[PDB]
Design goal:
The structure is cut from a larger assembly and holds chains A (122 residues), B (207 residues), C (37 residues) and D (175 residues). Helices cover 8% and strands 35% of the residues of chain A. Chain A is mostly beta strands and 122 residues long. The longest helix of chain A is centred in the C-terminal third of the chain and has 6 residues. The longest helix of chain D has 22 residues. The chains are: A mainly beta (122), B mainly beta (207), C mainly beta (37), D alpha+beta (175). The complex binds potassium ion, magnesium ion (10 copies) and zinc ion. Chain B binds three RNA strands through strand 3, helix 1, strand 5, strand 9 and strand 10. Chain C: One of its GO terms (biological process) is translation.
Chain lengths: 122, 207, 37, 175
RNA sequence: GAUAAGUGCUGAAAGCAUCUAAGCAUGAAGCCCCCCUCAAGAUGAGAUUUCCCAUUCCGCAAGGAAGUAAGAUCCCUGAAA
RNA sequence: UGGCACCUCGAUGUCGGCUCAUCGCAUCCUGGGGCUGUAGUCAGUCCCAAGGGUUGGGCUGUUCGCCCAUUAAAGCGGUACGCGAGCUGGGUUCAGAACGUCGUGAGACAGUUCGGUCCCUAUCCGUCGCGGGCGCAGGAAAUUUGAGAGGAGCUGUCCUUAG
RNA sequence: UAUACGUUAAGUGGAAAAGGAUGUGGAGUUGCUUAGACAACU
């Protein structure tokens, strides 16, 4: 459950280390984002010499959450952290490598580049 | 229009053929009996009166026994009517069984919601609290009763009072399974009322 | 449609009519449709 | 009224009857038409010569006079010759077909459009880009013809859509 | 289903024309329904099914009183309330 | 914004915010239309329409406004500039103190600044719930019709039609 | 639910202007008109 002021780890090499959630997209009063949802965020921590720089307003997709996601078959998946990937509008990641496992839910939302790049898609 | 009376037994879950896990409510409906057919000529409208759940003789009184004498059945604990039914397809004394429904059929389920007793505006009407800190002395109160001009409160200003225990219909539930041997209906999702409470399952009115 | 208090012929071909106790101007030119109001 | 004063010579094979309620029936080759008229209208039939008479010269009566004559004139010509309104389909791909007793129109929508003619009307479709409404009552032909044209009224840039036969569609310049 | 703005058909007054005067349509998240809930104190107190049955006193009657029928309550064990 | 001084000085508590709304339509979105200097996508303007909906933050006591990010939309007003015997008390106008300035001065603002007690057990009507009594031409047990009342009423994106 | 004679169709009566209008009633003037008008038809 990602909301405004939630800080996320970045699971790629775009240059951002930590982002702060500015806004959850996709409906007027929408309070919370979950895995697979796109958020607007600011880069709070950046890697020196990265493509993305501290203080930039970027779009990201949430790839891991502590709350996790329930599946139709009645199973659940949770992670120990909330992580996102900086993206463009076409849903390609702005980085080139994805770190850590990502949820199967990204395939449903057509984040296929991210899924292919992930070291594990659970 | 089809319908049947039953008791709410509880909830569980069932795996679908495609692997999905569907939560279901178990409704137990010992065969209902048609006690009376009302007609437009005699009564002014068409309806079938279903009796359910045979009551002990001791608990039944003489007026009840006479009413169910024509149907030739034990007195029933629960009597309800169904309107919109095919009158000619029913006869007094006919037993209505769960097998009128089939898996996948869409039904409406009526019941009385669980009572909650005296509840405040927050719980009863889902209103917002005031601040809990910053000097606030306004936490679970129901809000201004209205403007000054009318010199009175408008009707429908929501306030604390008894909550729950109202008749409530849930529409467009799916029948998951019909266990004719045990007279059970498995309906997807949940329905109003406490366990053992009377439930009415009708063919969906929006179908 | 022009909805104005002053409905008048704008050209010679405009015709003033009264439909439903309302003064109107119908004309071949669609810009000249007027209704009083 | 000039219009109301006119007298309608009934053709040979047309029969006009009335029930003294100003309910003139008119049988003829194409069919039968019934129409209740305003009580205070003297309708006379003297050997295939119809005339209407106004009792008093006054706004309401003057109007009803001319109308009653006009409507009678249509009833007689209707059952004898009958009326018809022609429609034209303009536009690439616009075409009309008759699936039994239902006009089917492919007028650039994502579905076909079906008009079912009401009792008394026939819709001939000589070509695919020409429709013909036929009937005894002049009102019903106009009504049905209007319904069909309403499906795709002529637009002003290219003229596409169902228009009436010989309708002066007011064209505009696009770019 | 009936309408609003709008679109009309037939049609005179006013040989033409005109959605209108008579007449006939179409047409909105809106109106009346459809859907959910309460509802006969609706004093206009409704309707249907079933049950009980014409007792004993007095008073000239009107009427009053006393036991009861069907049924219900007090009281008691409780909660799904 | 004013003009008047008719009610209130043996008291009709203030700006902003919070809780709760309600109404008008001069309609912000959604719905239906006329005209266009409307090709399409968009728009402009006018008509009908009040059913529902009409965001979260940074700065500031703020209303407002600017800005950040969204949304179909971020409507305009009335209700004692709705709502303090419902809350808050940051601003402003009690007593302290200080700066600038004015004054011979006590002090003052043509300006600022830090700190500063928000009382009341609901009688009546009203509002939300729950009972007792009687009535409804016999006494009861169930099931009901619906005069009438309330509720709900929102909308995005994508695929297809079809490049 | 008077009498007599007219007016209004707007529930005007029972709320407001400039302005607009083939609403309707009553007076008057004047152009043309069976050597044939207005309208519609070559
Ligand atoms: K000094
Ligand atoms: Mg406290
Ligand atoms: Mg009052
Ligand atoms: Mg004075
Ligand atoms: Mg006083
Ligand atoms: Mg006081
Ligand atoms: Mg308006
Ligand atoms: Mg105020
Ligand atoms: Mg108050
Ligand atoms: Mg303060
Ligand atoms: Mg009082
Ligand atoms: Zn014109």
């Amino acid at each position: 459950m990602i909301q405004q002021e939630t800080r996320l780890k970045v699971a790629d090499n775009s240059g951002a280390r930590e982002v702060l959630t500015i806004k959850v997209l996709g409906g007027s009063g929408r309070k919370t984002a979950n895995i697979g949802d796109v958020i607007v965020c600011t880069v709070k921590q950046a890697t020196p010499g990265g493509v993305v720089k501290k203080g930039e307003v970027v779009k990201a997709v949430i790839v891991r959450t502590k709350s996790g996601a329930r599946r139709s078959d009645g199973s659940y998946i949770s992670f120990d952290e909330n992580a996102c990937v900086i993206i463009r509008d076409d849903k390609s990641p702005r980085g080139t490598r994805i770190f850590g496992p990502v949820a199967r839910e990204l395939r449903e939302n057509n984040f296929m580049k991210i899924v292919s790049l992930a070291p594990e898609v659970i | 229009t089809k319908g049947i009376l039953g008791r709410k037994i509880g909830m569980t879950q069932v795996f679908a053929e495609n692997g999905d896990l569907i939560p279901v409510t178990v409704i137990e409906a010992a065969p209902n009996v048609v006690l009376q057919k009302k007609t437009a000529e005699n009564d002014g409208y068409e309806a079938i009166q279903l009796g359910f759940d045979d009551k002990r003789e001791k608990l039944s009184n003489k007026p009840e026994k006479g009413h169910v004498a024509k149907a030739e059945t034990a007195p029933k604990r629960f009597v309800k009517e169904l309107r919109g039914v095919e009158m000619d397809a029913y006869e007094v004394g006919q037993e209505v069984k769960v097998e009128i429904f089939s898996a996948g059929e869409i039904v409406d389920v009526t019941g009385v919601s669980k009572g909650k007793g005296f509840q405040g505006a927050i719980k009863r009407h889902g209103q917002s609290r005031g601040p809990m800190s910053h000097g606030s002395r306004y936490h679970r109160r129901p809000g201004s009763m209205g403007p000054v001009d009318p010199n009175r409160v408008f009707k429908g200003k929501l306030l604390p009072g008894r909550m729950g225990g109202e008749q409530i219909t849930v529409q467009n539930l799916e029948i998951v399974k019909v266990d004719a041997e045990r007279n059970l209906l498995l309906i997807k999702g949940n329905v109003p009322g406490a366990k053992k409470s009377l439930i009415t399952v009708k063919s969906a009115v929006k179908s | 449609m022009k909805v104005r208090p002053s409905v008048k012929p704008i050209c010679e071909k405009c015709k003033v009519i009264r439909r439903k106790g309302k003064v109107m101007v119908i004309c071949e030119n669609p810009k000249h449709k007027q209704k009083q109001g | 009224s000039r219009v109301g004063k006119k007298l309608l010579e009934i053709p040979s094979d047309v029969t006009v009857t009335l029930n003294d309620n100003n309910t003139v029936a008119v049988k003829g080759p194409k069919g039968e038409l019934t129409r209740t008229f305003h009580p205070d209208m003297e309708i006379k039939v003297e050997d295939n010569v119809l005339t209407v008479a106004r009792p008093s010269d006054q706004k309401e009566h003057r109007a009803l006079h001319g109308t009653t004559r006009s409507l009678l004139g249509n009833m007689v010509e209707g059952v004898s010759k009958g009326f018809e309104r022609g429609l034209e389909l303009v536009g690439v791909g616009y075409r009309a077909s008759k699936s039994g007793n239902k006009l089917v129109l492919n007028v650039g929508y994502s579905h076909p459009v079906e008009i079912v003619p009401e009792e008394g009307i026939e819709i001939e479709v000589p070509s695919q880009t020409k429709v013909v409404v036929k009937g005894t009552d002049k009102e019903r032909v106009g009504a049905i013809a209007a319904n069909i044209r309403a499906v795709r009224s002529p637009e002003p840039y290219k003229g596409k859509g169902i228009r009436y036969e010989g309708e002066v569609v007011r064209r505009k310049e696009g770019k």
